[PDB]
């Protein structure tokens, strides 16, 4: 078609709508959106007015983690009894005010020193199940060396999280990032996927944001979305940022981004790669835009 109903109808594809939280915020367990814990979806739609309210973080290679968690389509989480013996658990930040009390991410455990000492953690959580599982951890970058020696009883913090397949190593750097939400520090969030029969081992001398369990990563037909359209109640399957599109005509002009079996976009009147960007990253963005330009031109000529 060339016009849209103007809303994202909730059937037959189940729609989880983040009124103020981005998918990564709900995954990390923002107190702002505690209702999103352990929820499942077929399409996750993010309003452009979303914002963060907990500890100001950043994700190294945010795009792939975002896409992986979106394609998971399931936020089911299992608490795991990690053996944090010589360290103190449940570090609570002031910025993440949950229930009129200082708190932190519901799925992350800020470990600090116990008895003014932080032993070199070496913990094992083997996978004895029959399914692939995903762990998410982080490294906190303090604003000053004082804020590091206060937290972990040693300046030279580092971490290595390894599986039988590969290893990952993170070094934290001390330095005041420009202040956001009156906090100069940083949190960097990573992830590690442990296959069935694999073993997860955490070996850190300090400066760790431990995981409280594992997420159930599964292959699925879910996806990710970014739009400001309201939620409707109709039954048209296709979903577009401008609304919804019944498949009355084999082509459409509403928007390139789409979900479901939908008419193809042309110049003339499930899960996919991104088609809109906020920044300029480089060569990869040019390639992922040129492929869409080529597809649009070829389908324009084929029509």
């Amino acid at each position, epitope marked *: 078609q060339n016009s849209s109903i103007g809303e994202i109808c909730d059937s037959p594809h189940q729609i989880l709508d983040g009124e103020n939280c981005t998918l990564i915020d709900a995954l990390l367990g923002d107190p702002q959106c505690d209702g999103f814990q352990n929820k499942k979806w077929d399409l996750f739609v993010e309003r452009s007015k979303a914002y963060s309210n907990c500890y100001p973080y950043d994700v190294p290679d945010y795009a792939s983690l975002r896409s992986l968690v979106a394609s998971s389509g399931t936020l089911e989480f299992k608490n795991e009894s990690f053996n944090w013996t010589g360290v103190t658990q449940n570090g609570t930040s002031s910025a993440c005010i949950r229930g009129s009390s200082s708190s932190f991410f519901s799925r992350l455990n800020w470990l*600090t020193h116990l008895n003014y000492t932080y032993p070199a953690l070496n913990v094992t959580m083997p996978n004895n199940e029959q399914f692939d599982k995903l762990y998410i951890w982080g490294v906190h970058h303090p604003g000053t060396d004082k804020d590091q020696i206060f937290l972990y009883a040693q300046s030279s913090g580092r971490i290595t999280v390894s599986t039988k397949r590969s290893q990952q190593a993170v070094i934290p750097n001390i330095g005041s990032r420009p202040r956001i939400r009156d906090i100069p*520090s940083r949190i960097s969030i990573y992830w590690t996927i442990v296959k069935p029969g694999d073993i997860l081992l955490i070996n850190s001398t300090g400066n760790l944001i431990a995981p409280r369990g594992y997420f159930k990563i599964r292959s699925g037909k879910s996806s990710i979305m970014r739009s400001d359209a309201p939620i409707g109640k109709c039954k048209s399957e296709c979903i577009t940022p401008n609304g919804s599109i019944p498949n009355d005509k084999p082509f459409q002009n509403v928007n390139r981004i789409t979900y479901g079996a939908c008419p193809r976009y042309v110049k003339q009147s499930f899960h996919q790669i991104e088609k809109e960007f906020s920044e300029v990253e480089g060569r990869i963005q040019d390639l992922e835009k040129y492929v869409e330009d080529t597809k649009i031109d070829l389908w324009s000529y084929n029509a």
Partner: antibody
Amino acid sequence: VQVMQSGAEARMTGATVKISCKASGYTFSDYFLHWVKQAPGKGLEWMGLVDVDNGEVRYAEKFQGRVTITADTSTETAYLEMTTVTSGDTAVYYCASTTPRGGNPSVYNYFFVDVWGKGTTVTVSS
Amino acid sequence: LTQSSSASASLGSSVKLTCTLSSGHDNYIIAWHQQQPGKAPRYLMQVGAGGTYNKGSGVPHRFSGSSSGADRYLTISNLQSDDEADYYCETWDSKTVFGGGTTLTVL
């Protein structure tokens, strides 16, 4: 940074007293302010710790219940008031500002004092 | 945690102060605060378990800390004139546990 206390005045036995403190020099508004009693000839005795950023108020075993401590977070000040003050409470109450947390999870070290108030003398007459 | 007795020394000499923990704690960090008579106090030091101490802003270099196990020490490199005062040690965070103070005098 600077911490100053409000000038006190003489009170009578059985009346009530009020003490005000404010530091405002730290650029986080997330710092703790202690309360320490010191009668002349005595040592420092802790009575409570106030979180100016939120509603957290702490107490010691000998001052729980009898003493109520508040803090106006909007103006970032801390107040201390007592009921039926006795003649023996003629002393100095000290408010000490801690290192601002700045979002950190308030480990053992963050509750230390580092700057003391100027000090005010509360006197109770017979 | 526990207090210590008062100290005195001649002008130009060196003096030391002590503040000790209970058997239940060995690695706890203490502080050091100074209080002149008829004057408001002034924070001056923090002492750790591993023989290493932390300093605040404006603290003098004339004072140097120490630790030799379950006890913490302060050392005045040199003291002259009307410099003596009281010295206290906070050793906790849940309670601002002061030992009781140590009084310094000249002779």
